[PDB]
């Protein structure tokens, strides 16, 4: 039925807040408002190289953003003439001191948001669902993971019946904690509908 | 309720006090019904809105300072 965000349950010692800044009772709103706007217009632009996490810090002008990209290469631009315009606008609609920090994660086939990103985008480019996606779960357990699952729900190929085609390989202990799982859902848009791409990836015990 | 005072509106005021400059035509055409009835309106054809249309109500005494739009039914159909 539900499943609930592993995330919205991993906020113990397994998922530390995406946005780390204390707030005043009154303040809270407008702060998060500008915040979600940052992530927002960032999303439209700095997608180009897989935007996973978006680490946020705020003390008092301390607008530190640690954009976990996927590969900041052809995204910082030559000499940083693209990091420039982004920090620029960042300042344009943030009445304080901005930060960029392109902290991409070492490895691709980890952190399910970008996994599912490529996943849904393959269907976005019409491609073979079960074939290339089984190849995706494949690639995950071909990277060194411990359990990969990709649910893809919606109008495959049209045909009224919106199935929920599902594939998996490796253990996915969702009721556990220490085990740690990364969850990421891509919002797949068929030219003819909206199908939901979703992925869980397992890591391991002890941590 | 105004605790100290009685609520009314100035449309009616400016209107009544200007026909009182003579005592002319036997019609007025008001859109407000939230207003409190006053005795200086004399009380001819206060034509008030209802919800569908303006419907003239007569006014003399016992409607003293109680609300206007109360002698305009609105709640059509009975039981």
């Amino acid at each position: 039925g539900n499943k609930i965000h592993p995330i919205g349950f991993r906020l113990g010692i397994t998922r530390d807040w995406e946005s780390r800044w204390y707030a005043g009772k009154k303040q809270y709103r407008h702060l998060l408002l500008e915040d979600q706007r940052i992530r927002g217009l960032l999303e439209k632009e700095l997608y180009s190289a897989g935007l996973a996490r978006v680490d946020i810090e705020r003390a008092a002008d301390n607008v530190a953003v640690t954009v976990h990209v996927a590969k900041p290469g052809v995204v910082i631009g030559r000499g940083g003439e693209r990091i420039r315009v982004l920090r620029e606008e960042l300042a344009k609609l943030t009445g304080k001191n901005v930060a960029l920090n392109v902290q991409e994660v070492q490895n691709p086939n980890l952190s399910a948001p970008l996994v599912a990103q490529r996943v849904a985008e393959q269907i976005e480019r019409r491609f073979a669902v079960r074939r290339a996606i089984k190849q995706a779960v494949q690639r995950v357990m071909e990277s060194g993971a411990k359990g990969a699952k990709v649910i893809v729900s919606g109008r495959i190929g049209g045909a009224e019946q919106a199935r929920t085609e599902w594939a998996a390989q490796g253990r996915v202990p969702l009721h556990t904690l220490r085990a740690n799982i990364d969850y990421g859902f891509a919002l797949a848009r068929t030219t003819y509908g909206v199908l939901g791409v979703k992925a869980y990836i397992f890591l391991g015990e002890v941590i | 309720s105004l605790k100290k005072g009685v609520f009314v509106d100035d449309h009616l005021l400016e209107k009544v006090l200007e026909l009182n400059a003579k005592g002319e035509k036997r019609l007025i055409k008001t859109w407000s019904r939230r207003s409190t009835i006053v005795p200086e309106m004399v009380g001819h054809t206060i034509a008030v809105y209802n919800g569908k249309q303006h419907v003239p109500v007569y006014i003399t005494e016992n409607m003293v300072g109680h609300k206007l739009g109360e002698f305009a039914p609105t709640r059509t159909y009975r039981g």
């Binding site: 709103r29 998060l32 915040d35 | -």
Partner: protein, 60 residues
């Protein structure tokens, strides 16, 4: 109507008593927990998706 409605209050009219809260991450007035300036479904989507500090998937 919808689009015009958010604009209706977004610009404060005549009387203080004609303002009504607005989920700026979904767009409604019903059950918008003013503390966050967020509706209830917008609330839960935010807190769940990890994009909300101070909270806790409470277990008290």
């Amino acid at each position: 109507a919808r689009k015009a409605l958010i604009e209706k209050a977004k610009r404060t009219p005549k009387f203080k008593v004609r303002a009504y809260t607005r989920c700026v991450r979904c767009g409604r007035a019903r059950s918008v927990y003013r503390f966050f300036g967020l509706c209830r479904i917008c609330l839960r989507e935010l807190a769940h998706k990890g994009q909300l500090p101070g909270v806790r998937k409470a277990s008290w």
